[PDB]
Design a protein around this ligand. Structure first.
Ligand SMILES: [Pt+2]
Ligand SMILES: [Pt+2]
Ligand SMILES: [Pt+2]
Ligand SMILES: [Pt+2]
Ligand SMILES: [Pt+2]
Ligand SMILES: [Pt+2]
Ligand SMILES: [Pt+2]
Lengths: 277, 272
């Protein structure tokens, strides 16, 4: 619609996180998620097969107990898994060791007429990262546009503080004048190595600017309301511009002024998940 | 001293890492380092107390065994430790990460020094287990003791940081885009490890302030990089003082899929 509409979103009901695809695509992704009978608490779609305009579709399943989750899923979907064999001596992992921590991926899996890759991880591990940034490896993925296909309201609540913290890190890094393009590129930079480390994508990493410009409408929807709520941040463009601006439009970028006094920088710093006591 | 001279640096003797303060400051810093009888393998100076445009001077001490090092340091300087408001727990803390004593008076200076396992640093420089320690050394530091040992462990860290910048940037970019991108990679790590007692600075002010040292570190690496080349002619690079923030160099890199895959495969994050 318009950028002005995006400034009217209700943060208190997480409206800036409520990214959902078109009805038909959504139906397909939902059918994929529901195909799994092992209980998925939060299901995430992300990547080129979710944000379009054939390709493998990327998912994350946040589950209550991964060991048990894989026990069930090994019975229902045994051919989704491929294990390393014992060639030589050991490298023998237990259920808890291989499944209990991190993101475990089954890749190039056919589910309901789609080729998919899904990573399974502990919901508890994710929520702790969203709250404290223990590593930010999981949190960083959720500072950028994703689609929550299941457990939406529960997840959005846990993620709002992660998103506003990423904005605050951006504000700490940027000068008193910046464009929204500078902001989103800065925010993407924060998680760029973490996405590589976690193998969220089987394809080559992308250029930071291409990431931002392809998803410009979703970065605006997430962060413009947070900018609007932020004391000391001033939108420079007039009400007229913001009502004439399509969120999908890359041809011009909003500009801002922020307070960069010492007291302001101290409050940004001390509100970070890294600095909570 | 010109930008052109910076390209002719010998990467094989780590000349791009050989950042030393003017001889004035250097003796003071080295007397601070030598005041300590607990042995320090590698001593690092950084921060505004080191790169001067008095203030507290920031140090990192990389040591062979931090628990045995703090044992000796608790004997020579027990006032440095603020623990008398409460040892097993303190000792557990010594082991991992960086332990700091701050606002400490030494040889005329008010200093802050962090103690960390040299082994932990070297492993991070090589593998980016966390990049918390390696990130500090992707940016200008002064190595005050243990230079040749440390420069050689760090060179792969620096060119890896350049490679991440090249992955992140388009086919055309300036040296300003690149230094700011590199600083972005380690910005949260510097906060998490509390390298600085003061508020974090703005990325662009960090770069512009230290533009001569980012240039000394990274310009010869860009030069040796396949697929990357300078856009400005030999003559402009002779007319540029490394401290001049009024003009920034430009670059063209190959961005084909194979070039990008080569940069990804050589990062420290790969287990192979
Ligand atoms: Pt639109
Ligand atoms: Pt169980
Ligand atoms: Pt079971
Ligand atoms: Pt079980
Ligand atoms: Pt929209
Ligand atoms: Pt304490
Ligand atoms: Pt060219």
């Amino acid at each position: 619609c318009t950028v002005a509409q995006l400034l009217k979103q209700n943060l208190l009901t997480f409206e800036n996180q409520r990214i959902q695809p078109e009805e038909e695509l959504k139906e397909n992704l939902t059918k994929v998620v529901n195909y799994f009978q092992a209980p998925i608490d939060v299901a995430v779609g992300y990547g080129s097969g979710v944000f379009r305009q054939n390709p493998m579709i990327d998912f994350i399943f946040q589950v209550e107990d991964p060991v048990k989750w894989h026990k069930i899923n090994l019975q229902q979907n045994p051919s989704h898994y491929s294990f390393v064999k014992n060639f030589g001596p050991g490298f023998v992992s237990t259920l808890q060791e291989s499944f209990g921590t991190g993101v475990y991926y089954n890749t190039h899996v056919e589910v309901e007429g789609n080729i998919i890759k899904y990573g399974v991880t502990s919901k508890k591990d994710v929520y702790e990262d969203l709250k404290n940034w223990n590593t930010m490896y999981l949190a960083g993925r959720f500072q950028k546009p994703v689609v929550i296909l299941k457990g939406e309201d529960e997840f959005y609540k846990e993620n709002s503080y992660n998103l506003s913290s990423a904005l605050h890190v951006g504000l700490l890094m940027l000068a008193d004048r910046f464009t929204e393009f500078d902001l989103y590129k800065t925010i993407v930079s924060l998680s760029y190595l973490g996405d590589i480390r976690m193998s969220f994508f089987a394809e080559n990493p992308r250029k930071v600017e291409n990431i931002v410009s392809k998803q410009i409408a979703f970065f605006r929807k997430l962060y413009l309301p947070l900018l609007y709520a932020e004391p000391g941040v001033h939108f420079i463009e007039s009400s007229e511009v913001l009502k004439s601006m399509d969120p999908s439009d890359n041809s011009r970028y909003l500009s801002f002024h922020q307070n960069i006094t010492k007291d302001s920088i101290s409050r940004l710093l001390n509100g970070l998940p890294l600095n909570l006591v």
